[PDB]
Design a protein around this nucleic acid. Structure first.
Ligand SMILES: [K+]
Ligand SMILES: [K+]
Ligand SMILES: [K+]
Ligand SMILES: [Mg+2]
Ligand SMILES: [Mg+2]
Ligand SMILES: [Mg+2]
Ligand SMILES: [Mg+2]
Ligand SMILES: [Mg+2]
Ligand SMILES: [Mg+2]
Ligand SMILES: [Mg+2]
Ligand SMILES: [Mg+2]
Ligand SMILES: [Mg+2]
Ligand SMILES: [Mg+2]
Ligand SMILES: [Zn+2]
Lengths: 225, 132, 343, 103
RNA sequence: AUAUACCGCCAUCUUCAGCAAACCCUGAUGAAGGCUACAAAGUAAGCGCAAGUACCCACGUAAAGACGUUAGGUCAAGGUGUAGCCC
């Protein structure tokens, strides 16, 4: 009797709004441009599945179309906020060691999880053996870098799909986005780009968790009286 | 390869007790002796007779409590007293255990001409140390 | 001598001879085999040849509120106790001899087609009672090894399905055949395809595909046609829930290629709703049993096109000579259209 | 006298349930392709063969033009054609009686 | 009689370090394969090694030493399957 009203006022209400958390106010094409998000790899490194998201090549250096990035980033941030609102487990994954420390801190601060270390065979597809039969896997995996250190796709991209976990991923021009649920074309190398991404996801996640508490608290106060 | 008193490895499904899991070289290191008497001490006599009595008592109790013994017997001798300590299961009715205790204590006391007492500890199932 | 006697376990371990160079390499075969028997099974503590009645051990301790005394069954009544134990012994032997047989597979000595039951319940209280498991191939694989020579392992192919569109297959590999069965069937339930069915009985359209060297041509059929397909396809179709289909397998008849080739083609079939959405037109079904009545099976969810689909006077579609040769009465085969059991 | 009653009893439902009486029957034959005719008869001089057909194996099943619920099991519900004998495994003798009772 | 039916107790490589399971992943779900530490699919357990213990130490020496190999040895330690003898 009271559960249907809970799920309707709290879980189903956010899904009726196009931007329930107002993640569009967090970034702009200019803010992305200042972080050098449009800078891609050289044309010789281009992946053919990234061609739709490329604005062009400036002297053999690919430029990422930030108009698309802004639209893709809006969806990825929106999905991430909704999953944080629903109290889903969010796991950040990246093998780029220049940013391992930064990413681990961002995860700890937002109350989520980070895996920046060597990824052992079967963390996702054999988790019950590795962790225990009652282990809960992540509900969302965010890749700040989708490639490993030998320039191949991070194994967790395939293994997240195998375990039916949606993935958000920054996809540079040499990356393969086919299996990434919510890809965001953007520069994955420059510290300004990576720092921006960590601020946006950290803020999206932190806002959605605070929104969940506000709604719950209001729903309880009104319930008693 | 050595064979003596070694429960060989299986597929991980054979339950063994603590005693069965320890080869002879662990005797006096990880496991104690199943009989304690003075016959094997330096300068002591009658080790031959104490040994035959122990072999009989183990066979006697195996066939007197058929299917009930959950581990090897522990035989203790103090003075002329003989104490038999056995770990048994909880399948036989208590009346049958009291009959067999009264019967065995009496028969063994007249056979070996000494006061014999039987101490029974019951366990719901054989205690498993590891699965070899 | 009493001291030379051993326990039953020691006596059976020796007499059975299950460990030894004979049993290591199966150097000894067993048409006649010593079978272990539990000789303490029907034995009652306190019962002996003399027929003594010990109060508290084999007879009740108290009778009519008084403690019973030592007594001995007379020769006649003791004789009946012994006879009753012999009959109970042969009766126990007879009941064990009786066992319920299992239905064979595609052939008497074949594993193919035999049901293995539902996959085992998962660790987290997960259950698959709705799923049935079928064996498709059991192979003996022989591996040459550096020190141990030719070793024998088992490769099993099994298919699982719930009969409502959810079906999968998996290979299992183990030294023991039963272990290979458990691995395959439990793995297959985690690799389930969903197969779309027209009216929950047939495929949506004719499917012709090649997987490696195995060709499979499948035809959509009406109700009552049954499964006229390679026996392995019949088995898989029952697991998926397809009741009416024709299939012809050509080229290499490799069970694995056929299984994964079949699942690839059934998982990539376009439904009528997908066709309507793709072309923004109505999908209209004409049935000869219903005359000229147009039966709309699917309508586009989005806007409905106003321009008719172009009418190419002659379609440039590739045809199967076998299909055409049959429609023209030029296909002669003694093996086609033979009477067979209901499938 | 009232053959349609057997199909309404509890004994019938326990033995066959809601499937046709021939659902679980399988012919024994060599090869993958069976002979194109079933056996002539399962009852030969009052003796029953080892693997009697679905009709002959149950003596309470009576092929009669009034026991329409049994007859329907040997007619295709979608096409109205009478199954040929190899379809269900009934002997030639009982298939003719089924065809005459159905007609 | 049969160690070429076995238990029991052992020789041997062993003055070895490997063996057998439960899973996971790659190869189009072919026979097969599964390691890179500035790490790229392997892993939670068992047995052996190791550790520990005995002897005078943490050294040494004992002991230990899996699975498998030689149908290795022993029916004459004892027991025992099968076959045979019972003036
Ligand atoms: K031997
Ligand atoms: K012997
Ligand atoms: K012998
Ligand atoms: Mg990059
Ligand atoms: Mg040695
Ligand atoms: Mg046969
Ligand atoms: Mg030998
Ligand atoms: Mg010491
Ligand atoms: Mg040492
Ligand atoms: Mg030594
Ligand atoms: Mg050691
Ligand atoms: Mg020899
Ligand atoms: Mg002998
Ligand atoms: Zn018949």
């Amino acid at each position: 009797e009271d559960s249907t009203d809970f799920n309707d006022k709290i879980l189903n209400e956010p899904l009726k709004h196009s931007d329930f958390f107002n993640v569009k106010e967090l970034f702009s094409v200019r803010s992305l441009f200042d972080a050098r998000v449009h800078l891609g790899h050289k044309a010789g490194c281009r992946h053919r599945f990234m061609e739709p998201y490329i604005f062009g090549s400036r002297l053999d250096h690919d430029i990422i179309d930030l108009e698309q990035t802004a639209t893709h980033l809006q969806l990825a941030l929106n999905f991430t906020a909704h999953m944080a609102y629903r109290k889903g487990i969010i796991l950040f994954i990246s093998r780029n060691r220049q940013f391992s420390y930064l990413i681990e801190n961002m995860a700890r601060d937002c109350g989520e999880y980070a895996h920046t270390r060597y990824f052992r065979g079967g963390m996702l597809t054999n988790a019950r053996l590795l962790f225990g039969p009652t282990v809960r896997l992540p509900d969302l995996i965010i890749f700040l870098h989708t490639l490993n250190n030998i320039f191949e796709p991070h194994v967790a991209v395939r293994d997240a799909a195998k375990m039916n976990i949606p993935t958000v991923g920054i996809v540079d021009t040499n990356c393969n986005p086919c299996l990434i649920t919510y890809p965001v074309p953007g520069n994955d190398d420059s510290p300004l780009a990576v720092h921006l991404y960590c601020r946006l996801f950290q803020t999206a996640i932190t806002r959605a968790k605070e929104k969940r508490q506000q709604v719950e608290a209001l729903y309880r106060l009104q319930g008693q009286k | 390869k050595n064979r003596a008193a070694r429960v060989r490895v299986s597929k991980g499904d054979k339950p063994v007790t603590y005693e069965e899991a320890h080869a002879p070289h662990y005797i006096a290191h990880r496991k104690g002796w199943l009989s304690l008497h003075t016959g094997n001490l330096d300068g002591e006599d009658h080790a031959a007779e104490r040994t035959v009595e122990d072999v009989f008592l183990r066979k006697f109790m195996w066939g007197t409590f058929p299917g009930c013994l959950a581990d090897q017997l522990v035989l203790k001798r103090r003075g002329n007293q003989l104490e038999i300590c056995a770990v048994v299961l909880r399948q036989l009715s208590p009346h049958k255990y009291y009959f067999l205790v009264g019967y065995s204590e009496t028969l063994l006391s007249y056979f070996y001409k000494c006061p014999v007492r039987l101490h029974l500890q019951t366990v719901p199932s054989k205690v498993v140390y590891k699965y070899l | 001598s009493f001291f030379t006697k051993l326990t039953a376990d020691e006596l059976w371990k020796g007499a059975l001879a299950e460990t030894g160079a004979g049993a290591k390499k199966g150097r000894g075969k067993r048409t006649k085999k010593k079978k272990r028997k539990d000789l303490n099974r029907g034995q009652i503590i306190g019962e002996g040849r003399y027929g003594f009645l010990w109060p508290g051990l084999n007879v009740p301790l108290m009778k009519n509120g008084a403690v019973q005394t030592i007594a001995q069954r007379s020769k006649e009544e003791q004789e009946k106790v012994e006879a009753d134990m012999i009959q109970q012994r042969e009766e126990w032997d007879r009941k064990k001899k009786m066992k319920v047989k299992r239905e064979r597979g595609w052939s008497g000595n074949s594993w193919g087609g035999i049901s293995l039951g539902p996959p085992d319940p998962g660790p987290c209280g997960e259950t698959y009672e709705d799923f049935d498991t079928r064996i498709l191939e059991v192979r003996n694989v022989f591996t040459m090894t550096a020190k141990e020579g030719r070793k024998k392992s088992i490769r099993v192919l099994v298919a699982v399905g719930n009969g409502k569109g959810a079906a999968g297959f998996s290979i299992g590999k183990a030294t023991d055949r039963m272990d290979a069965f458990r691995k395959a069937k439990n793995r297959a339930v985690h690799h389930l395809h969903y197969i779309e069915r027209y009216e929950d009985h047939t495929i949506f359209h004719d499917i012709s595909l090649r997987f490696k060297r195995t060709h499979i041509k499948m035809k959509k059929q009406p109700k009552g046609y049954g499964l006229r397909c390679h026996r392995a396809i019949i088995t898989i179709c029952r697991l998926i829930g397809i009741k009416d289909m024709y299939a012809k397998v050509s080229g290499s008849i490799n069970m694995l290629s056929l299984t994964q080739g079949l699942f690839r083609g059934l998982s990539r079939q376009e439904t009528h709703q997908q066709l309507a959405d793709k072309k923004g037109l109505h999908v209209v079904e004409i049935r000869e049993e219903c005359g000229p009545l147009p039966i709309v099976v699917a309508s586009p969810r989005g806007p409905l096109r106003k321009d008719p689909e172009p009418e190419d006077e002659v379609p440039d579609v590739k045809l199967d000579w076998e299909d055409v040769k049959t429609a023209q009465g030029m296909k002669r085969s003694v093996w086609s259209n033979l009477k067979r059991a209901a499938t | 006298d009232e053959p349609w009653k057997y199909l309404e009893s509890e004994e019938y439902q326990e033995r066959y349930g809601s499937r046709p009486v021939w659902a679980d029957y399988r012919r024994n034959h060599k090869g993958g392709v069976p002979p194109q005719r079933t056996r002539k008869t399962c009852i030969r001089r009052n003796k029953v063969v080892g693997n009697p057909c679905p009709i002959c194996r149950d003596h309470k099943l009576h092929v009669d033009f009034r026991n329409v619920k049994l007859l329907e099991q040997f007619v295709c519900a979608h096409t109205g054609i009478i199954f040929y004998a190899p379809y269900t495994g009934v002997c030639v003798k009982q298939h003719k009686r089924l065809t005459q009772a159905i007609q």
